[PDB]
Design an enzyme around this catalytic site. Structure first.
Site, short mmCIF file in Angstrom:
data_model
loop_
_atom_site.label_atom_id
_atom_site.label_comp_id
_atom_site.label_asym_id
_atom_site.label_seq_id
_atom_site.Cartn_x
_atom_site.Cartn_y
_atom_site.Cartn_z
N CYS A 204 -7.37 55.10 50.50
CA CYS A 204 -6.80 55.45 49.19
C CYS A 204 -5.24 54.92 49.40
CB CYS A 204 -6.74 57.21 49.23
SG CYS A 204 -8.14 57.56 48.25
N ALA A 206 -1.97 53.19 49.77
CA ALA A 206 -1.54 51.99 50.64
C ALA A 206 -2.65 51.64 51.75
CB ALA A 206 -0.46 52.45 51.13
#
EC number: 3.1.3.48
Lengths: 270, 83
Positions: A204, A206
Site C-alpha cells: 500500500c 509507498a
C-alpha cells in the site's frame, strides 16, 4: 533508540542498482520517483501486452529472510495503470495472501487504489479474472476471499485471501500491538494451511514504511514461533537484511519502536 | 543517475521575538517519510511528518537546517538558513 538514525545514515547511499525502474518507459509505473525496486530482487513480469515497450516491470521486490512460503512481496499501492500488472504479479508468483496496510483514502490522500471487485461481483483485469465470493469483517481488518484465474484457462483458479488492515491511525503507529499480532497470526494460519503457496504480498502507498514494519514483525515472530525465547532477536540486523532487497524498509522511529513492542508483546504472550 | 535537492527552498515567513514560522517547498512525486529540523545559535532537534510544509519553533533568545528522509539520491547536504 538512536540506532534507527544509524541505519538511516547507512541508507544515505544505496549499494545496489535500480536501473530498470529509472527507464523512461517505466516512469509512469512508480508512485514516487525516489522509491524504486532493486534490480537484483525486483519481480520480473511475464506475459505482458506486446503493444507496450516494457511490460516486465512492477515496483515490487521479493523479500527473503536470511541470517516462497516464508518469503514476501513488498510493493507499492496500485496505480490506475498498474492494476493489471499487480494481478499479473499475484498470478505469476502463485501468491495466496495479500496484506493491505492502508485504507483506500486516508486524510484525503489516495494511498491504495481499489483493485478488487465488490462482494459477489466479478471483474477482468487484462487477462486475469477475479471473483469476490465472500467478505468478512473483524475489529482490526477486513478479509476478502478472491478467486484468481487466467481468462480462457479455468484450470488455473486459486483462492487469494486479502487481509485489509484498517485500524492503523492516520498519524503515528498503534498504541498497542495486539491487533497487529492477531492479524498476523490469522495471516500465518492462512498461509501455512496452503501447500505450495507463493510469497505473501504486503503492499500500500509507498510500500516500505508500514510494509516494512509488518514484514519485519512477521519474520521475528516466526523466529520466536520456531525456536522459542532462546533465540536472538536482532531488529537492526533484520532491518538491514530486508533493506538489502528493498530500499528503506521501516521509515519512522515510531515504527522502529513498534517492532520492539510487538515482539515483546508476543514473547510475553507465549 | 539523477539526484534531487529536498527541500528546494527554506523561508522564514513570520516571526515573533521568541517564535519563528519556518516554511519549505516540497518536491512533487518525491517520497519524504519525515523531516528533521535542527536549530541552534550561529543544537536542538525535532521531527515533523512528511505531509507538512510549515513548522513553528519556540523558546528562543540562529541557524536552521532541514533534513528529509529517506536520505539517498539527494544533493549531498541539507538546506539551511540564518536568522
Amino acid at each position: 533508540w538512536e540506532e534507527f538514525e544509524t541505519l538511516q545514515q547507512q541508507e544515505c547511499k544505496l549499494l545496489y542498482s535500480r536501473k530498470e525502474g529509472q527507464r523512461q518507459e517505466n516512469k509512469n509505473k512508480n508512485r514516487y520517483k525516489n522509491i524504486l525496486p532493486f534490480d537484483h530482487t525486483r519481480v520480473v513480469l511475464h506475459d505482458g501486452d506486446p503493444n507496450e515497450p516494457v511490460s516486465d516491470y512492477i515496483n515490487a521486490n521479493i523479500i527473503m529472510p536470511e541470517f516462497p512460503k516464508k518469503s514476501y512481496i513488498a510493493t507499492q499501492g496500485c496505480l490506475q495503470n498498474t492494476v493489471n500488472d499487480f494481478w499479473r504479479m499475484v498470478f505469476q508468483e502463485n501468491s495466496r495472501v495479500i496484506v493491505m496496510t492502508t485504507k483506500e483514502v486516508e486524510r484525503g490522500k489516495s494511498k491504495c487504489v481499489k483493485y478488487w471487485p465488490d462482494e459477489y461481483a466479478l471483474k477482468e483485469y487484462g487477462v486475469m479474472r477475479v471473483r469476490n465470493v465472500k467478505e468478512s469483517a473483524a475489529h482490526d481488518y477486513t478479509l476478502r476471499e478472491l478467486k484468481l484465474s487466467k481468462v480462457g484457462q479455468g484450470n488455473t483458479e486459486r483462492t487469494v485471501w486479502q487481509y485489509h488492515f484498517r485500524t492503523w491511525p492516520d498519524h503515528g503507529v498503534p498504541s498497542d500491538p495486539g491487533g497487529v499480532l492477531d492479524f498476523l497470526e490469522e495471516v500465518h494460519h492462512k498461509q501455512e494451511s496452503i501447500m505450495d503457496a507463493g510469497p505473501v504480498v504486503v503492499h500500500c502507498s509507498a510500500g516500505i514504511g508500514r510494509t516494512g514494519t509488518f514484514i519485519v514483525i512477521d519474520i521475528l515472530i516466526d523466529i520466536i514461533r520456531e525456536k522459542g525465547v532462546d533465540c536472538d532477536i536482532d531488529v537492526p540486523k533484520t532491518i538491514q537484511m530486508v533493506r538489502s532487497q528493498r530500499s528503506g524498509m521501516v521509515q519512522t522511529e515510531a515504527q522502529y519502536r513498534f517492532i520492539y513492542m510487538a515482539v515483546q508483546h508476543y514473547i510475553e504472550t507465549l | 543517475g539523477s539526484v534531487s535537492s529536498v527541500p528546494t527552498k527554506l523561508e522564514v515567513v513570520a516571526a515573533t521575538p521568541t517564535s519563528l514560522l519556518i516554511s519549505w517547498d516540497a518536491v512533487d512525486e518525491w517520497y519524504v517519510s519525515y523531516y528533521r529540523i535542527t536549530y541552534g545559535e550561529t543544537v536542538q532537534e525535532f521531527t515533523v511528518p512528511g505531509y507538512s510544509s510549515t513548522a513553528t519553533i519556540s523558546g528562543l533568545s540562529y541557524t536552521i537546517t532541514v533534513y528529509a528522509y529517506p536520505l539517498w539520491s539527494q544533493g549531498g547536504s541539507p538546506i539551511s538558513i540564518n536568522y
